[PDB]
Amino acid sequence: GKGDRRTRRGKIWRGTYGKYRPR
Amino acid sequence: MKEGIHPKLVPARIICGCGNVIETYSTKPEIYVEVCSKCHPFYTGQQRFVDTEGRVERFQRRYGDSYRK
Amino acid sequence: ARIAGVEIPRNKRVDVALTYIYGIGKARAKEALEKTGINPATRVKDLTEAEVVRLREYVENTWKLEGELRAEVAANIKRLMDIGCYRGLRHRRGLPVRGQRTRTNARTRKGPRKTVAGKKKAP
Amino acid sequence: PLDVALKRKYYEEVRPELIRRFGYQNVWEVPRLEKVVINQGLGEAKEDARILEKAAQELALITGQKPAVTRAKKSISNFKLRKGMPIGLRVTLRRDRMWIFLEKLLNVALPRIRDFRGLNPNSFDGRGNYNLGLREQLIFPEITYDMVDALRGMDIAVVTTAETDEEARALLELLGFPFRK
Amino acid sequence: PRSLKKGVFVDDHLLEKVLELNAKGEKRLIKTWSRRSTIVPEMVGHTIAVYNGKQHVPVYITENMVGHKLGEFAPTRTYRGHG
RNA sequence: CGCGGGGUGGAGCAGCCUGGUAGCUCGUCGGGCUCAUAACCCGAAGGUCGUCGGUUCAAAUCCGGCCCCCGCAACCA
RNA sequence: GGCGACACACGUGCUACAAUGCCCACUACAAAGCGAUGCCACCCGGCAACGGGGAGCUAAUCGCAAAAAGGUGGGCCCAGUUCGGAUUGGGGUCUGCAACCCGACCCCAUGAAGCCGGAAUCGCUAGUAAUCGCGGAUCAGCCAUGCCGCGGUGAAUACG
RNA sequence: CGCCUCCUAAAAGGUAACGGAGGCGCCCAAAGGUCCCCUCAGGCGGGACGGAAAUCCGCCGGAGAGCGCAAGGGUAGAAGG
Ligand SMILES: [K+]
Ligand SMILES: [Mg+2]
Ligand SMILES: [Mg+2]
Ligand SMILES: [Mg+2]
Ligand SMILES: [Mg+2]
Ligand SMILES: [Mg+2]
Ligand SMILES: [Mg+2]
Ligand SMILES: [Mg+2]
Ligand SMILES: [Mg+2]
Ligand SMILES: [Mg+2]
Ligand SMILES: [Mg+2]
Ligand SMILES: [Mg+2]
Ligand SMILES: [Mg+2]
Ligand SMILES: [Mg+2]
Ligand SMILES: [Mg+2]
Ligand SMILES: [Mg+2]
Ligand SMILES: [Mg+2]
Ligand SMILES: [Mg+2]
Ligand SMILES: [Mg+2]
Ligand SMILES: [Mg+2]
Ligand SMILES: [Mg+2]
Ligand SMILES: [Mg+2]
Ligand SMILES: [Mg+2]
Ligand SMILES: [Mg+2]
Ligand SMILES: [Mg+2]
Ligand SMILES: [Mg+2]
Ligand SMILES: [Mg+2]
Ligand SMILES: [Mg+2]
Ligand SMILES: [Mg+2]
Ligand SMILES: [Mg+2]
Ligand SMILES: [Mg+2]
Ligand SMILES: [Mg+2]
Ligand SMILES: [Mg+2]
Ligand SMILES: [Mg+2]
Ligand SMILES: [Mg+2]
Ligand SMILES: [Mg+2]
Ligand SMILES: [Mg+2]
Ligand SMILES: [Mg+2]
Ligand SMILES: [Mg+2]
Ligand SMILES: [Mg+2]
Ligand SMILES: [Mg+2]
Ligand SMILES: [Mg+2]
Ligand SMILES: [Mg+2]
Ligand SMILES: [Mg+2]
Ligand SMILES: [Mg+2]
Ligand SMILES: [Mg+2]
Ligand SMILES: [Mg+2]
Ligand SMILES: [Mg+2]
Ligand SMILES: [Mg+2]
Ligand SMILES: [Mg+2]
Ligand SMILES: [Mg+2]
Ligand SMILES: [Mg+2]
Ligand SMILES: [Mg+2]
Ligand SMILES: [Zn+2]
């Protein structure tokens, strides 16, 4: 879910990037 | 020993995860185990596992002495 | 009782099964398998006895798990409580530790509500 | 009798080390193992079931010896206990069946305890006997998680002829009992 | 935490206070307001008076509380529960 | 030391007879409706049964002493 | 230092309780805005936050930029789970004189309540509700899930 | 108001008062017969859940346990299991 930061969905929510949502 | 009330003990081969084999008697002819006494980290002498730390926290919080002497 | 001391559930893929071990999330499940050549899709039921010990050996030796991890987590809380730092008082009285406000929620840390009586109006 | 590794070890290794450790003038002075008594004080099966069966069947697999029922001596209201209710299983292991169980208890069972850090050195009888307690019965190799239905533990009494704790601790460590401290 | 590309933070004025004591055969009672100054190995054995906003609480510093800030040991709010 | 009855959540009453299970109405507290209150609606908490002692595996319940509180009786002389 | 307290109580919201869903990879289609100790292409270090290089743009030109739901392919198979992401341990990053009280982010681990919510109660009549994402003001940073805007997909129903 | 136990009852028996205290009006198909075997309570030390007290082990322990229910007598060289 959007609250799960360790996912490509939660990173979109916080507007941030990481291993779980790279660019 | 009373007749007909006990399970027959038979020669038994016990197999551990460290390729170890034990020749004992049991009610099952061959038993496989994931751990024995020949490899338990307590049994195998000191065998300090993942933790050789102690700790080194905390006074080993060096890096660095970069305040001017 | 297979690896470490927990039986990882059969019928599931091996990568999710290993997560049922305290100390292994999804990313560590990704490692151990790849570092040992076991198809992450293989069902636990369908692993060699050779693959059991190969998966087991690495898992149990690379990182500390179940009981020891809890003992080292407990040791650090205990340490914070012993020295008397502000985090140590939080873990004592049972209040949150990471800056969260307590006027309203904190229920995960406080537990069920303890409803009290309130101040009254005038008729 | 027959050949069990632990027994042959008691004579070959442990007896001479004991004599040279303590100076026994008589060969019957040196400590011996006498019996192993296993106690499952259940009480869950007071009336809630005759689960004593599935628990004696597993005690029978672990020891090779059919357990016997123990019944409540007195009645106890707080315990919900009428005098005579079947509230446990006890089995007295002696001679070779004692060795075979002790041999597996050290070689496979105690290591299978999770967070195992050695047997308590303080649990000696004061008079040379030892007791320990287990919380799971699947610590033993004859028991599998598929064959179990509910976790039951036990008390293990190992009786020796040693007059003192000091002699008995030497007897049990030399045989291979990992003591914590 | 503070980016270790930068140093471990001590307000310097407090750090002088302790290195003089070591040199002169410590220890005096050290009263500071730098609740932020990181506890640093040159402090163990001393006792620093930390201002929590009202008072200077004494703080005896031991080896097992080094990676911390001084304010951690002089709490700022007194509680005692509700009636 | 004439004979009865009674003592249990805050109030008033079950439960005792027949030992194992504390209950009912109001009240009290949190929410709701109302502009607000009451009523009303939704939730919850509070009694180790006057007391000491005994019987029993187990006592509010059964037995004995004490405390307290109401009721009856006290006739022929 | 406190405005961030916490036996409690209420309002407004975010995230969900899953399969019309979740997850990974591939691949499409916006609008309105902002941008000179500003936005940062691309490049190497790093699992990542970021760091170091380093073009272009005083901006219908260069940049923020990837829009997301969607479309395709594959994985999960009804579990308190590959649902959910609170809480907590450890390790870092960055802005800042300074992140103890009291920052945001990233990574390993931890993985709570929650199985659709009592009495009661809110909004919306159409490109509306619902759902998807995007930008701006404030601003060193930011507790923004708030506000002011922006388009994407797109219903049900009105007897009275 | 009949029955049982203890005391009063003055070391045989018996012995009164509106003298001091309790109990009975059942029960058991084994709680009966016999044979064979077994020995308690409690104290302390030891043992997962497990507590003052469940079950287990060692040591001590002549009977203070038990013997359906009052009391007394009796009793493990059994009447107890
Ligand atoms: K008359
Ligand atoms: Mg997830
Ligand atoms: Mg220095
Ligand atoms: Mg796990
Ligand atoms: Mg706070
Ligand atoms: Mg000799
Ligand atoms: Mg045999
Ligand atoms: Mg001792
Ligand atoms: Mg086993
Ligand atoms: Mg002995
Ligand atoms: Mg009262
Ligand atoms: Mg009352
Ligand atoms: Mg009645
Ligand atoms: Mg009744
Ligand atoms: Mg009631
Ligand atoms: Mg009210
Ligand atoms: Mg008005
Ligand atoms: Mg009202
Ligand atoms: Mg109620
Ligand atoms: Mg009374
Ligand atoms: Mg009762
Ligand atoms: Mg007359
Ligand atoms: Mg509420
Ligand atoms: Mg909100
Ligand atoms: Mg709300
Ligand atoms: Mg942006
Ligand atoms: Mg769960
Ligand atoms: Mg639940
Ligand atoms: Mg999950
Ligand atoms: Mg932390
Ligand atoms: Mg801060
Ligand atoms: Mg479900
Ligand atoms: Mg609904
Ligand atoms: Mg309208
Ligand atoms: Mg959604
Ligand atoms: Mg800003
Ligand atoms: Mg916050
Ligand atoms: Mg926004
Ligand atoms: Mg008569
Ligand atoms: Mg009669
Ligand atoms: Mg006489
Ligand atoms: Mg007499
Ligand atoms: Mg006569
Ligand atoms: Mg006469
Ligand atoms: Mg009578
Ligand atoms: Mg008959
Ligand atoms: Mg009889
Ligand atoms: Mg008979
Ligand atoms: Mg004990
Ligand atoms: Mg016990
Ligand atoms: Mg009796
Ligand atoms: Mg009686
Ligand atoms: Mg007697
Ligand atoms: Zn082994």
Swiss-Prot record, chain B:
Gene3D superfamilies: Ribosomal protein L31
GO cellular component, one term: ribonucleoprotein complex
Record carries keyword DNA-binding: no
Keywords: Metal-binding, Ribonucleoprotein, Ribosomal protein, RNA-binding, rRNA-binding, Zinc
MF (Gene Ontology): metal ion binding; rRNA binding; structural constituent of ribosome
Co-factor binding details: Binds 1 zinc ion per subunit.
PROSITE patterns per the UniProt record, alphabetical: RIBOSOMAL_L31 (PS01143)
InterPro entries (alphabetical): Ribosomal_bL28/bL31-like_sf (IPR034704), Ribosomal_bL31 (IPR002150), Ribosomal_bL31_A (IPR027491), Ribosomal_bL31_sf (IPR042105)
Oligomeric form and interacting partners: Part of the 50S ribosomal subunit.
Similarity remark: Belongs to the bacterial ribosomal protein bL31 family. Type A subfamily.
Database matches in NCBIfam families: L31 (TIGR00105), PRK00019.1 (NF000612), PRK00528.1 (NF001809)
Annotated function: Binds the 23S rRNA.
Name of the protein in question: Large ribosomal subunit protein bL31
Organism field: Thermus thermophilus (strain ATCC 27634 / DSM 579 / HB8)
Name of the coding gene: rpmE
UniProtKB/Swiss-Prot annotation, chain C:
UniProt keyword RNA-binding, yes or no: yes
Listed GO CC annotations: cytosol; small ribosomal subunit
Region (Disordered): 94-123
InterPro entries per the UniProt record, alphabetical: Rbsml_uS13_C, Ribosomal_uS13, Ribosomal_uS13-like_H2TH, Ribosomal_uS13_bac-type, Ribosomal_uS13_CS
An example Gene Ontology molecular-function term: rRNA binding
Keywords noted in UniProt: Ribonucleoprotein, Ribosomal protein, RNA-binding, rRNA-binding, tRNA-binding
Statement: the UniProt record of this protein carries the keyword S-adenosyl-L-methionine: no
BP term (GO), one: translation
Signal peptide: none
Recorded family membership: Belongs to the universal ribosomal protein uS13 family.
Subunit structure: Part of the 30S ribosomal subunit. Forms a loose heterodimer with protein S19. Forms two bridges to the 50S subunit in the 70S ribosome, contacting protein L5 and the 23S rRNA; these bridges are straddled by the 5S rRNA.
NCBIfam families: uS13_bact
Protein function: Located at the top of the head of the 30S subunit, it contacts several helices of the 16S rRNA. In the 70S ribosome structure it contacts the 23S rRNA (bridge B1a) and protein L5 of the 50S subunit (bridge B1b), connecting the top of the two subunits; these bridges are in contact with the A site and P site tRNAs respectively and are implicated in movement during ribosome translocation. Separately contacts the tRNAs in the A and P sites.
Protein name in UniProt: Small ribosomal subunit protein uS13
Organism (species): Thermus thermophilus (strain ATCC 27634 / DSM 579 / HB8)
Swiss-Prot record, chain D:
Function (record text): This is one of the proteins that bind and probably mediate the attachment of the 5S RNA into the large ribosomal subunit, where it forms part of the central protuberance. In the 70S ribosome it contacts protein S13 of the 30S subunit (forming bridge B1b) connecting the head of the 30S subunit to the top of the 50S subunit. The bridge itself contacts the P site tRNA and is implicated in movement during ribosome translocation.
Biological source species: Thermus thermophilus (strain ATCC 27634 / DSM 579 / HB8)
Keyword Cytoplasm tagged: no
Protein name: Large ribosomal subunit protein uL5
InterPro entries on file: Ribosomal_uL5, Ribosomal_uL5_bac-type, Ribosomal_uL5_C, Ribosomal_uL5_CS, Ribosomal_uL5_dom_sf, Ribosomal_uL5_N
Entry's family note: Belongs to the universal ribosomal protein uL5 family.
Keyword tags: Ribonucleoprotein, Ribosomal protein, RNA-binding, rRNA-binding, tRNA-binding
Sample GO molecular function, one term: structural constituent of ribosome
Coiled coil: none
Subunit structure: Part of the 50S ribosomal subunit; part of the 5S rRNA/uL5/uL18/bL25 (TL7) subcomplex; has also been isolated as a complex with 5S rRNA, bL25 (TL7) and DNA binding protein II. Forms a bridge to the 30S subunit in the 70S ribosome, contacting protein uS13; this bridge is straddled by the 5S rRNA. Contacts the P site tRNA.
Pfam families: Ribosomal_L5, Ribosomal_L5_C
GO biological process, one term: translation
A cellular-component GO term for this protein: ribosome
Domain of life: Bacteria
Swiss-Prot record, chain E:
Gene from which this protein is expressed: rpsS
Pfam families in the record: Ribosomal_S19 (PF00203)
Subunit structure of this chain's protein: Part of the 30S ribosomal subunit. Forms a loose dimer with protein S13.
A GO CC annotation given for this chain: cytoplasm
InterPro entries documented for this protein: Ribosomal_uS19, Ribosomal_uS19_bac-type, Ribosomal_uS19_CS, Ribosomal_uS19_SF
Record-level GO BP terms: ribosomal small subunit assembly; translation
UniProt similarity note: Belongs to the universal ribosomal protein uS19 family.
Molecular-function annotations in GO: rRNA binding; structural constituent of ribosome
Keyword field contains RNA-binding: yes
Superkingdom, taxonomy of origin: Bacteria
Record's keyword annotation contains DNA damage: no
Record keywords: Ribonucleoprotein, Ribosomal protein, RNA-binding, rRNA-binding
Annotated source species: Thermus thermophilus (strain ATCC 27634 / DSM 579 / HB8)
Role, per record: Located at the top of the head of the 30S subunit, extending towards the 50S subunit, which it may contact in the 70S complex. Contacts several RNA helices of the 16S rRNA.
Gene3D superfamilies, sorted: 30s Ribosomal Protein S19, Chain A (3.30.860.10)
UniProt protein name: Small ribosomal subunit protein uS19
